[PDB]
Every structure is written in C-alpha cells, then in structure tokens.
Write a protein that binds this ligand. Structure first.
Ligand code: T0F
Ligand code: NAG
Ligand code: NAG
Length: 400
C-alpha cells in the first residue's frame, strides 16, 4: 500500500550467473547495464579508451561524450576519501578471484534510474572507470557493477543512499525478487501481491553488522538433522552478486554426502542402486533424525526415475524437482525457514543442478540460489532483512 518503484531485472543462474538492470548515465543519457550486487558499494564499468576491456552488451562509457562528466583529478597529490593519486588521477582499483585486478580512475556524472511506470530519479554519483579488466570481467555480457550496500561515515556516497535521498516519497526499503529468468528490484517496500497464498507472512531477521548485509545462521538441517557443527551464529552475507550460496566445507561435505546418495546416474545399474539401498541409520557417522524422510526421498527418486547427471566439480543435476528434500536454515529463536529445491537448484539445460558451493576464504554467502523465488526485503531503517516466498515477475532478456 506504499508507493513502489519497480525496475526490471535480467539474467539467470546458468547463462549469465547474475542479474542486471539498465541505468542511464551522462548527459545525454548513455544506457549501461549493471550487475545488481548487494555485496559491494561501488558503481564501475569500462570507459572509452580502455586498452584491455571485455566485449560487453554496451560500449565503454564515453566521458568526452557526456557534457556533465567530471574526472576526479588529484590537486597537490591528495585525493578525497583516502584514495590514491596515480598518474594525476584518483585511482579506482579492485581485486577479485586470485589476484585479478581491474584498475582505473574515479569520475563523477549524472545517473538516472527510471521505473517501468516512467518515474525518474536523478543524481550525481562517484563512479570508477575500468581502464583494465581481468579474468571473469573479460567474459560477462553485463557492462558493469551496481553496488547496493550502504554508505559508511565519511565514505563515497553509494547508489542506494543517493537513490533514497533523492526520492523522499519512498520508504527506505528495497526488495529483490529474482525468478529462474530475470526478476524485479522494488524501491519503497515490497509487493504483497507477489507473496504466495491469503498472502503469507514475512520472516524478519536483524542484521549483525551496520552498513553491511550480514545475518546470523545458527543451523542448517537436512532430514531434521543439523549439519552445522556449531549452533553459534554464522555470519552470512546476503549477497545478490554471488551466483551460488557458499558454506563452510564441513557443512558442505555433510550435505553433498546425502545429495551424492540421491544422485543415481543409471537406474538400472545394480551396483549403484544396491550400494544405496544397503544403507542404514548406523552407517552415516551422522544419524538422520528423520531417516525415514531420507528413505522417502531415495525410494521416490528411484520410483519416478529422477535420474541425475554429475557435471564439473561433481555437481549433481536432477531431471525433476520432485523428491529432493527441503532444507531449513535456523534464524533467531528456533525459527526454521524452509529452503525449497526450486531455490537451491537452478535450471541448467533441462536439469536441476545443485547451487550450493563451498565457501572461499571463510566467506559464507547467501547467494542468488537463496534469493530465487523469494522476495528479499532490505529494511534499511530498521536494520532487518526480510524473506517471503513469492511469485517473482519473470523477464526473458528478449524484452529489454
Ligand atoms: C560475490 N561477489 C560480489 N558480491 N561482487 C563481485 C562480482 C559480482 C558479480 F556478479 C560478477 C563479478 C563480480 F566481481 C564484485 N566484488 C566486489 N566486492 C567488493 C567490493 C568491490 C567489488 C567489485 C565491484 C566492481 C567491480 C569489481 C569488483 Cl571486484 C566481489 C565480486 C564477488 O565475488
Ligand atoms: C532486533 O532489533 C530491534 C531494534 O534494535 C530490537 O529491539 C530487537 O530486540 C532485535 N531482535 C533480535 C532478535 O535481535
Ligand atoms: C536414527 O538415529 C537418530 C539418532 O540416534 C534417531 O533420532 C532416529 O530416530 C533414528 N532413526 C531410525 C529410523 O532409526
């Protein structure tokens, strides 16, 4: 019942591995597609002149063509926001993967964000110009990154804080609703009409740290058995910019053990099927408090011929969602939030592949495979993040 501004999201888990929206930048407008990333705060892309940039959906943003672009030069060799001064410009630098770096320079210009009901919000933004991209940036279709995290004291004003400072008619809330193909970013609150039904209720979880999107996960259950070797709160970044949900190797190895069992590549191979049916509560090292629920899945995966192909890294893909078990993450109190297979599995070709990976460098992340088929509600002012199952809008990329 609030006032909501809605923006179309494009992408998917398998082909793009992220979700992006379009943004007008400069004067006159240069449309730039940006990866929606709640795990970062910058807004960067390549710029005309880049001598090592990928081929993206748009050309590099052309400063000389924007009547209103202003390169942040360092006078006296001193940059604001404790930035570095290189070759007479305030440096933009990033590190990702294993030492890869995109370097460049900061500049400013007009950014315009329009909803699909034609409501326009404009403001000047500090942004980075990629003059050098590497690794995964050399082969993603999207042109840049739109960081969605909050502004720190005496830091570069971020897109989200500028958006709301220039839209006082909107409550300080934005929702991300991603489906298998494309999604929707909502500014001003969430749409209850997307909530499955009459409409279900939002689960609210306070955020552990301020300025960041961390929440505490105090347990992850499969078949009624917590696979987390600790009930202490595990801080996990609610990150729209990571394709998959990442977890500590202990929790992953204990989950992938039961997914491996449920993965049968040939339903007529006796050794494979025999090896799995000859399993009992006492052969797990982790007895299943709902071992019958486990048996239920296994029998049904063999009954309905839900075959499973393993791909790179030993990631399982099933023919059907039917059979795969629900997962339950434990939040504040003892509230168990259901994590359905249509979220943690993603569509690859015709199968459903596991979208749960090991954490890299003690960085547990609730990624897009946790977003999918939910509304993820960022209540900036109350320092809480909400989750509700929803029929998220869908937008094939041939509608842009
Ligand atoms: C999960 N995750 C992410 N959340 N965002 C990242 C990204 C997202 C994505 F869809 C595709 C490629 C990406 F590089 C980006 N990134 C960052 N992190 C903290 C400050 C800054 C960044 C960052 C901003 C812009 C350009 C390059 C970088 Cl490096 C870290 C990356 C990452 O691994
Ligand atoms: C969540 O935050 C509010 C406001 O700070 C506080 O009153 C409430 O007790 C918190 N709840 C939990 C479970 O931390
Ligand atoms: C399996 O073992 C756990 C723990 O001992 C128990 O709670 C559960 O009921 C057992 N299930 C079966 C089918 O034996």
């Amino acid at each position: 019942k609030d006032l909501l501004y809605k923006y179309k999201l494009y992408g998917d888990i398998d082909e793009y591995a992220y979700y992006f929206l379009d943004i007008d930048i400069g004067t006159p407008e240069q449309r730039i597609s940006l990866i929606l990333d709640t795990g970062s705060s910058s807004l960067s892309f390549p710029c005309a002149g880049c001598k090592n940039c990928g081929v993206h959906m748009e050309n590099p943003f052309n400063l000389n063509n924007s009547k209103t672009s202003s390169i942040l030069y360092c006078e006296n060799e001193e940059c604001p926001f404790k930035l570095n001064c290189v070759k007479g410009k305030c440096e933009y630098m990033q590190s990702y993967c294993e030492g890869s770096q995109i370097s460049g320079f900061y500049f400013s210009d007009v950014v315009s964000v329009v909803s699909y009901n034609n409501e326009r919000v404009t403001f000047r933004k500090l942004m980075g110009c990629h003059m050098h991209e590497e690794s995964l940036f050399l082969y993603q279709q999207a042109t840049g990154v739109l960081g969605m995290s909050l502004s720190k004291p005496q830091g570069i004003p971020t897109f989200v804080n500028l958006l709301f400072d220039n839209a006082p008619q909107l409550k300080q809330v934005f929702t991300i609703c991603i489906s298998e193909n494309g999604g929707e970013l909502i500014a001003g609150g969430y749409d209850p009409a997307y909530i499955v039904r009459e409409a279900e209720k939002v689960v609210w979880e306070n955020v552990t740290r301020k300025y960041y999107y961390y929440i505490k996960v105090r347990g992850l259950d499969m078949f009624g058995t917590n696979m987390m070797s600790s009930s202490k709160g595990l801080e996990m970044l609610v990150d729209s910019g990571s394709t998959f949900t990442h977890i500590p190797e202990d929790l992953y190895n204990k989950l992938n053990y039961f997914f491996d069992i449920l993965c049968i590549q040939d339903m007529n191979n006796a050794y494979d099927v025999n090896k799995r049916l000859k399993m009992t509560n006492e052969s797990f090292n982790n007895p299943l408090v709902q071992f019958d629920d486990f048996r239920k899945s296994l029998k049904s995966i063999i009954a309905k011929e839900n075959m499973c192909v393993k791909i790179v890294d030993g990631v399982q893909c099933w023919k059907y969602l039917e059979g795969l078990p629900d997962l339950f993450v434990t939040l504040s109190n003892n509230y168990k939030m259901k994590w359905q297979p249509h979220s943690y599995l993603y569509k690859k070709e015709s199968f459903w592949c596991k979208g749960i990976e090991k954490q890299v460098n003690n960085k547990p992340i609730l990624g897009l495979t946790f977003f999918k088929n939910r509304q993820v509600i960022f209540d900036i002012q109350k320092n809480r993040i909400g989750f509700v199952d929803a029929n998220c809008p869908s937008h094939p990329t041939h509608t842009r």
